[PDB]
Design a protein that fits this description.
Blueprint lengths: L19 H5 L4 H14 L15 H13 L3 H18 L6 H13 L6 H17 L10 H10 L5 H17 L5 H19 L4 H18 L5 H6 L2 H12 L1
Helix pairs in contact: 2-4, 3-4, 3-5, 4-6, 5-6, 5-7, 6-8, 7-8, 8-10, 9-10, 10-12
């Protein structure tokens, strides 16, 4: 006698094998991967909607975060990233809390140093999903901590990290449809200085991402507000950016 017809919520914490803790902390690579893969194949991969109430996902997410941050086996890293992505996407907000985010966000940003296609793709997907539910550019300003973390990684000494994190930031700018106010507050004093460094990088792959960043910024705020910055860049780079705005 009610109006809603909803998808039932599911639980997964009760389905973690009793030897999960033991296997996930084993020195043997196969022990960790089998534990991760079996839980993924039989439980997580088929999950459609997760229950938040009285379900404390911190331990599990903490385990995944630790793996992403320190595991020497990139296959275990990929599996952990895939698992985190799933939990965030099926629990959504407010269930997947900022406390939960803290257990996995920096680890993922740090691990963007990985180059193996399948591994970095898994890390990328988890980061994009987390940023979808917790928009770093949120006008509320609630996620500026995440924004600062991303901006800091865009200045990382490791080229792969600068590139991947700048691409993540670009995705956030392109996906934004709920207010540009926060992005604008960070624009001239924090964002532009970093994008300029990316655009002037000696590596062409990095410069390309930088041109994309500036082009996106121009499509959002307009050309006029960046005239001073653009006029200071090398003539060739300015032209590259203008051309990218069209593409």
């Amino acid at each position: 006698s009610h109006m809603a017809s909803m998808l039932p919520e599911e639980t997964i914490l009760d389905k973690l094998p009793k030897d999960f803790q033991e296997r996930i902390t084993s020195s043997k690579w196969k022990d960790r991967v089998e534990a991760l893969e079996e839980f993924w194949d039989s439980v997580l991969s088929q999950t459609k909607k997760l229950k938040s109430t009285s379900q404390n996902y911190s331990n599990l997410l903490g385990i995944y975060g630790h793996i992403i941050q320190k595991d020497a086996n990139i296959q275990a890293v990929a599996l952990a990233a895939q698992s985190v992505e799933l939990i965030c996407d099926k629990l959504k907000t407010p269930g997947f809390s900022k406390d939960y985010v803290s257990l996995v966000f920096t680890p993922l940003l740090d691990r963007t140093k990985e180059k193996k296609p399948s591994v970095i793709e898994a890390i990328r997907k988890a980061l994009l999903t987390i940023c979808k539910y917790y928009d770093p550019l949120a006008s509320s300003g609630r996620n500026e901590d995440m924004l600062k973390d991303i901006l800091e990684h865009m200045k990382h000494k490791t080229p792969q990290i600068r590139m991947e994190c700048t691409q993540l930031f670009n995705a956030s700018m392109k996906e934004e449809k709920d207010g540009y106010s926060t992005l604008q507050r960070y624009l001239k004093d924090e964002v532009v200085p970093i994008v300029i460094q990316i655009v002037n990088d000696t590596q062409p792959a990095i410069r390309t991402i930088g041109f994309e960043s500036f082009a996106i910024l121009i499509k959002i705020f307009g050309m006029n507000t960046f005239v001073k910055t653009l006029e200071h860049l090398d003539n060739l780079k300015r032209k590259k950016i203008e051309e990218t705005v069209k593409t």
